[PDB]
Symmetry: C3
Subunit: 493 residues, 3 copies
């Protein structure tokens, strides 16, 4: 209703208004980045620092030690920690967990010389930063919030974000404020779903030139994305999880077998060392990476990575918190705070150290002095060469195509559901109306997906997330303030 | 009496014994510095580390959580935190908060190359060190002390420092020990008041060559200082705070408007970044700056700055603690510990980041490649060029002359009062005797003021503080030991 | 019995199987090092990190605050802290506390250039790491264990390590597992006693070419070691501590007088600074040194030092913990945790800063540009030149020969006792059997001693400890797991 159409038009105007002119599009998107980034980047860091302090308070202060709800944990502790370990479902992870370290060593932070021994020493470590405990802790607050809104303050938070900012909401969030926030939210949240898409596709697509060599061309990106949505509409068409249940159970079965594979093959001893050293590098540099900013040098690093990644982390905040909340009925506040960081950091670290060491090795020993060169056709390209360069370069590259495919096939569905529930009747779940609704936003996510690929930079996707979280930085501080002042007076049994 | 004359003569002998020979004076003062500094510098650091650990204990151990006195806080919490934010009343702050960063970038710590990109990266950060939480926490102990001596242990501490070392005082501090400590104290405490003076004057004086261009010459320094004391004697002459009450209320009104001005003009976005980066630099380097010493290199930095600043911080210790104590009736021990650091660090940080960024910008973009050159006539000079180089270079430079003037006019009075109470009848306040007493020490502070300017280095003022705190390092450890062993057995309600 | 012969043969086969071929011996020992080190080094670091976290839990969690036994502390607090300060009894300490800093500055960590100003800046600091609180805290756990096994869980732990792994021991450690662990233990524990020996001798021996110049030759190493065991057998021969009691009381009297000497002479002011700076360097670099690994550079440092030293620390773990446990009857868990680190770190720091500054000074100011050159005959050599170069180069070098002699004379005995009790009747102490047993292992420790010196590297002794702790890393994790799960359910009064 008041949240349905607003996105719809805002995207649409942005679309054939982008599709009309990409040479001019790629100059606005380009200037907004170097605006929001250079001018307001510090805000994004301070945000995460504050949310990080959040985690300490949540752990050591008042509402720690206090049963986040009724008695009974719906899942066992280990089932819980694993439920988190396995929750990663995105393929943009395999993208970034592949070239990230390459970009770190080619343009280092800290004025270290490109490709130097030192540059390489900080590579994995900066992954361990960007994807370790810190960012995962910045979820604890909005988690313990959205979980308190659920199991102690039995006020089931209807999907939109507004349905929980009355406790702060001066101008009743059931009105305009709440609505102009929920679509502000939804818009970035779709753009992000569009950014995952417009990364996950080229990986599958390029994987395809390793299957009797079907080409990659935008057209082919364009075909496989719609080939998604159809296979995903005709998946909703009838009711039975005899496929989509076991799908996820494979996507995680395969991913751990594939990373186990890269781990073992890449050399266990090397990684066990490079990890160890990178921890100490991380710990050493942690305060410097947090507040790493427009140096007087003006290199653009943290601006390019930290600030961009953090916007992204901002966008999927509450979202990931509803999830973490919904699987944590019985837990203490402190339990969640620990459990999630342990569980999530474990899955995220293994990923980037494994895939990213393997990349560093390749770049280092002259085995595919390609990334640098291969950027003369495709980033996405290099990333699969990174897979390619491995033992049994067939069974892997297949494992990589399938795991990479049925990963994004599960993404398209779960976040068209999440996207439908946010514009629907309150009462139950996917009842009578939730139909051509889900199947339509599929088309919408996907069409922004190619829109970006048409523009073809990394910027198009970078600015997309940045502009996204910019708003949702506020939306987040709100949901969390809203939570405190409630809980504040509404606890102390 | 036993504290009046001793200072008087010790200063006097030092005076026309300096005034006889400055070319020989500037060789003793020169050798005592490079004595006390190089040989005993570590002591000053360890001191501050210990006092810093102090703050942790004070916060997490026993006397935390325990009402520092009776029930009722004389001021509200916000009035309290602001009372601290606004308490800065010195102009030597505007001196150091101006050239400090210049000196950091021209002679860096850590063997970084002068003027390099890296040197500049550490500039503000080292201000944030020297003037952030750490040094301000090293006050908490002597605060919670002098505040305990007041509101739980109703034993109103008569102005001299001795009147509270019997609880430790083996050879009753009411005797000789106590007395030879109170003038040892008073002597450095005046020398310091003399050092503030002999910095605050040239700022006003040079500001004056921006007022139809009245010269600066020592003579003119000499005239304006006595022009102080007269305007300050004839201020005591009759009783009414229809001027000296509203004076302070202006000096703080103007300073925040002037720093707000420099902030906005200098570029908000730049500063917000340079601050952010400098925090992370500070946090990164904090353990290294604390214990930063005579490297094997023997560069002289920490020796020159850290050790000198810390002596200064040592001197105005108890003094600033009586003050902080006297405004904190109702507070908890932990409250004070937090409140003061927050409140004080807030005011101190804003200052040095604002004024000091503005300086770095100027030095950086070739806009006044002067500091280096302008040192061929005046440091004090450069500092106002730093003001000068700003938009509406008239309204500012006036704002800077006035704020800089009526700042030191309030300094001369408040610390001639503090200087009079320390040599007076116990009973009440400024009763019958406190008259020609206050007006005389005015003359004494001021005359040491020019004495230094006659010698004209930064050393004269540097060694002055160093030699000062050297003693008072002990005097401090005393007042604080004295406090513990009392409180120790004299608490646990 | 089941622990007596197994060592005996395992050493013996290793002996004339080494003594047959040193040119081939020095190629296996050489390859096992660069195996265990390069491939499994991280394990040794993680171990110490875990044990370091151990100390936090032991201090802040459950069994803190809880009387480690009955009421009465057998020794006073100060007697206790000193008992720890003085417990150092090894001469390999004077070896490492002598050339360590030289090796740090000649091959630095972190890619700093050999002999550079920066290299020297990190020298002492890396000693403060390797021999400060961290490693000493990694004892707290096995201490609080072995002390709990004693005074709350009155189950006097018969000397072998197995006699306390039933609480974990699945396949009853009274059987084979326990036995094949106790000799696995004993073997490394002797090898280590052999490594102390094969370092302590050349120090005494070279000290001897400063006594009308008796030569040093292996033969002479070989003679003085047996001259040990005889003087040590004929020490057991009859019963009276009219010599061996007052021996220790001298060895510690002399060592503190000798280090007091080097301290004062070397320049108090310099050291007080170099210490101070090195603390801040240590604190700064601490997370980096902990996890310092096979860089991508592959320099071999941490591999060479950290990993080797840590193996050593692993070997003398439980051993040093039985000791620390046995002197801490009345103490709280937290008490021990603090007491030991304070006490032990105090003795260890003073040592390496004093001896190691003195070395740096010598290397620095061109006063004995010898270490580099003198390695063309003896490391052991250089180390005494380091003593030699001092004021009253006779009274010292004598003090160094005697303190260095009667230090190792006490070592040979105390750890042939410890070595005998581990293969003996349970009931009392040195009863009827404990005789030709102690005197025999003397011969065994000593013969491995020269075996190493015959091979003559630092590697022979380095790999000896490495291979040692490799096993005992496990043996340690065991004794400590075993302890938790007992205490776990067997506490909570
Ligand atoms: C990471 N990367 C290379 C995409 C962006 C850079 O960090 C910023 C830049 O290119 O200057
Ligand atoms: C999709 N991905 C993981 C790359 C971006 C988001 O940060 C995911 C997340 O952190 O939960
Ligand atoms: C990252 N994203 C949005 C793809 C997935 C959600 O954040 C978490 C989920 O849907 O389980
Ligand atoms: C995670 N989620 C919501 C999909 C499944 C439920 O949490 C499990 C349940 O409600 O029993
Ligand atoms: C800061 N300054 C330049 C005044 C003193 C220096 O740090 C010491 C020096 O000049 O060597
Ligand atoms: C006058 N000033 C501020 C420069 C030196 C003292 O350190 C002031 C203070 O710290 O309270
Ligand atoms: C710094 N000084 C001495 C100028 C002022 C006092 O320390 C504080 C005060 O008088 O309020
Ligand atoms: C700060 N001081 C002492 C000047 C004013 C008083 O604290 C206020 C009062 O005593 O009511
Ligand atoms: C310390 N030392 C020199 C014995 C071993 C080195 O660290 C390793 C090496 O020689 O490469
Ligand atoms: C003999 N020494 C001290 C050199 C090696 C061991 O580490 C000693 C110890 O740490 O207890
Ligand atoms: C280091 N070592 C084994 C020589 C001595 C023991 O560890 C401690 C002791 O016997 O007191
Ligand atoms: C340290 N040790 C065991 C040698 C002596 C005893 O602890 C002292 C005692 O048992 O009275
Ligand atoms: Hg679009
Ligand atoms: Hg994934
Ligand atoms: Hg998506
Ligand atoms: Hg793929
Ligand atoms: Hg399909
Ligand atoms: Hg169907
Ligand atoms: Hg399904
Ligand atoms: Hg999603
Ligand atoms: Hg923003
Ligand atoms: Hg003077
Ligand atoms: Hg001020
Ligand atoms: Hg003054
Ligand atoms: Hg002025
Ligand atoms: Hg005047
Ligand atoms: Hg008057
Ligand atoms: Hg007045
Ligand atoms: Hg004052
Ligand atoms: Hg001093
Ligand atoms: Hg041997
Ligand atoms: Hg020793
Ligand atoms: Hg031994
Ligand atoms: Hg010796
Ligand atoms: Hg002998
Ligand atoms: Hg005998
Ligand atoms: Hg004896
Ligand atoms: Hg021993
Ligand atoms: Hg091992």
């Amino acid at each position: 209703p008041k949240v349905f159409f607003p996105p719809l038009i805002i995207v649409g105007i942005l679309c054939w208004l982008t599709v009309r002119d990409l040479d001019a599009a790629n100059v606005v998107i380009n200037a907004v980045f170097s605006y929001v980034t250079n001018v307001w980047g510090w805000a994004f860091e301070w945000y995460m620092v504050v949310m990080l302090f959040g985690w300490f308070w949540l752990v050591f202060g008042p509402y720690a030690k206090k049963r986040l709800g009724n008695e009974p944990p719906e899942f066992s502790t280990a089932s819980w920690i694993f439920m988190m370990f396995a929750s990663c479902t995105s393929a943009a992870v395999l993208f970034w967990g592949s070239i990230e370290i390459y970009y770190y060593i080619s343009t280092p932070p800290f004025g270290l010389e490109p490709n130097s021994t030192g540059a390489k020493e900080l590579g994995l470590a900066y992954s361990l930063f960007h994807w370790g405990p810190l960012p995962w802790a910045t979820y604890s607050f909005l988690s313990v919030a959205f979980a308190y809104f659920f199991f102690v303050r039995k006020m089931e938070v209807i999907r939109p974000s507004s349905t929980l900012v009355p406790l702060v909401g001066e101008k009743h969030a059931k009105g305009l404020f709440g609505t102009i926030v929920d679509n502000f939210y939804l818009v970035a949240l779709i753009f992000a779903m569009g950014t995952s898409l417009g990364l996950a596709t080229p990986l599958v697509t390029e994987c395809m030139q390793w299957l009797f060599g079907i080409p990659h061309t935008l057209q082919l990106d364009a075909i496989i994305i719609t080939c998604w949505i159809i296979l995903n509409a005709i998946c909703v068409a009838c009711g039975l999880q005899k496929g989509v249940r076991i799908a996820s159970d494979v996507r995680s079965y395969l991913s751990f077998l594939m990373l186990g594979w890269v781990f073992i093959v890449s050399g266990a001893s090397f990684i066990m060392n490079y990890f160890t050293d990178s921890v100490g590098m991380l710990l050493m540099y942690l305060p410097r990476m947090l507040f790493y900013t427009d140096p007087i040098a003006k290199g653009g690093f943290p601006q390019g990575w930290t600030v961009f990644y953090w916007a992204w982390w901002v966008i999927y905040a509450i979202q990931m918190s509803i999830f973490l909340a919904r699987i944590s009925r019985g837990r203490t506040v402190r339990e969640l705070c620990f459990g999630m960081v342990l569980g999530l950091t474990a899955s995220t670290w293994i990923l980037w150290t494994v895939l990213g060491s393997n990349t560093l090795l390749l770049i280092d020993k002259n085995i595919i002095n390609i990334p640098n060169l291969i950027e003369q056709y495709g980033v996405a390209r290099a990333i699969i060469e990174t897979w390619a360069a491995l033992p049994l370069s067939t069974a892997t590259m297949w494992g990589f195509f399938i795991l990479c495919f049925i990963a994004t096939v599960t993404l398209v569905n779960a976040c068209s559901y999440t996207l439908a529930m946010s514009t629907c009747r309150e009462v139950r779940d996917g009842e009578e109306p939730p139909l051509l609704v889900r199947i339509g936003w599929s088309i919408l996510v996907g069409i922004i997906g190619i829109v970006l690929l048409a523009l073809g930079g990394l910027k198009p996707i970078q600015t997309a997330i940045i502009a996204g979280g910019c708003p949702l930085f506020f939306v987040n501080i709100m949901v969390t303030l809203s939570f405190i002042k409630d809980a504040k007076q509404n606890w102390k049994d």
